[PDB]
Amino acid sequence: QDLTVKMTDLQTGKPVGTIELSQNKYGVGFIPELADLTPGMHGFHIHQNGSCASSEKDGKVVLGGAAGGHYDPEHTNKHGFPWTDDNHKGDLPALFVSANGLATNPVLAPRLTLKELKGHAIMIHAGGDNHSDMPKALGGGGARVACGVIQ
Amino acid sequence: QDLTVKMTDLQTGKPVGTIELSQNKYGVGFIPELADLTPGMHGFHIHQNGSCASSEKDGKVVLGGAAGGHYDPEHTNKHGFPWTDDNHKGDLPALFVSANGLATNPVLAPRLTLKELKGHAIMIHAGGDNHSDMPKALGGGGARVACGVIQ
Ligand SMILES: [Cu+2]
Ligand SMILES: [Cu+2]
Ligand SMILES: [Zn+2]
Ligand SMILES: [Zn+2]
Numbered sequence: 146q147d148l149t150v151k152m153t154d155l156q157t158g159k160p161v162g163t164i165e166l167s168q169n170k171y172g173v174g175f176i177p178e179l180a181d182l183t184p185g186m187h188g189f190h191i192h193q194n195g196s197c198a199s200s201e202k203d204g205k206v207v208l209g210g211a212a213g214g215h216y217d218p219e220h221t222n223k224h225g226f227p228w229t230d231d232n233h234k235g236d237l238p239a240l241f242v243s244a245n246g247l248a249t250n251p252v253l254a255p256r257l258t259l260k261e262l263k264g265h266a267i268m269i270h271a272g273g274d275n276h277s278d279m280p281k282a283l284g285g286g287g288a289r290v291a292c293g294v295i296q
Numbered sequence: 297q298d299l300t301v302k303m304t305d306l307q308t309g310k311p312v313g314t315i316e317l318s319q320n321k322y323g324v325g326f327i328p329e330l331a332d333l334t335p336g337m338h339g340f341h342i343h344q345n346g347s348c349a350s351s352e353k354d355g356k357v358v359l360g361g362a363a364g365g366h367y368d369p370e371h372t373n374k375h376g377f378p379w380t381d382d383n384h385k386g387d388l389p390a391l392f393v394s395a396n397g398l399a400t401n402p403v404l405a406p407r408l409t410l411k412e413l414k415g416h417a418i419m420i421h422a423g424g425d426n427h428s429d430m431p432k433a434l435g436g437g438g439a440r441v442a443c444g445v446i447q
Contacts, residue, residue, distance in 0.1 A: 171406040255322040
């Protein structure tokens with residue numbers, strides 16, 4: 146009922162820490178213990194496929210692309226807040242990284258259950274997340290910088 | 297059912313923006329539109345008294361002290377997470393301020409209802425919030441840097 150998730154830097158292939166997932170009566174808590182990340186807010190979402198391998202897009206390599214799109218069991222095909230229902234159920238609150246490159250601020254996803262996360266990937270993006278597909282799709286998260294699979 | 301909250305810098309007495317509170321089926325959403333704040337994570341809590349005036353502590357002035365301690369209707373007398381019940385019900389997720397001094401990342405408090413917040417003050421601290429009374433009390437938020445009352 147409680148699984149630690151190893152996270153790997155997609156560019157370097159080097160481990161950057163772990164993320165602990167806990168079920169509580171309000172949702173799933175995500176407690177990071179990561180390092181070597183660029184300071185600031187990062188797009189943070191659960192993804193469809195249970196893989197962190199790369200994919201291919203029109204001739205270019207997509208790091209962590211094998212994970213697929215954002216977890217969306219309701220097939221909303223929209224990106225939004227962690228507290229709104231008509232958008233990817235995998236949309237999590239943005240993840241904060243200190244000036245020292247560390248991420249330790251815990252975060253909650255009220256619409257998720259721990260059980261449904263098994264076999265899915267957790268992704269950390271380079272850009273932020275304004276919880277909209279505007280001006281940039283998927284909240285402007287951009288490239289995927291860190292990933293881990295939830296066994 | 298939806299009230300905009302004007303926030304004031306305690307040191308300068310100058311307005312720093314507003315914070316919109318919205319009730320959703322998962323809790324109370326807090327959407328900031330503030331400026332002139334020091335970059336980084338800030339302690340963010342709802343306080344007991346409906347005032348942002350100063351107070352007095354053993355001969356020294358306490359900016360925003362009139363607001364009293366953290367909202368704690370269950371009298372837990374402990375500081376913790378926004379998703380744990382045996383701690384101040386007024387404990388909110390930390391607030392992020394960009395390098396440009398702006399705060400725009402929305403935040404959720406699942407244990408609160410919009411109705412119960414009327415007449416209370418929202419406080420923003422200088423330090424962060426590790427959601428514990430250790431090593432520093434109240435999460436290490438420290439001095440109060442910005443405040444507003446929820447009419
Ligand atoms: Cu993502
Ligand atoms: Cu406070
Ligand atoms: Zn999404
Ligand atoms: Zn507290």
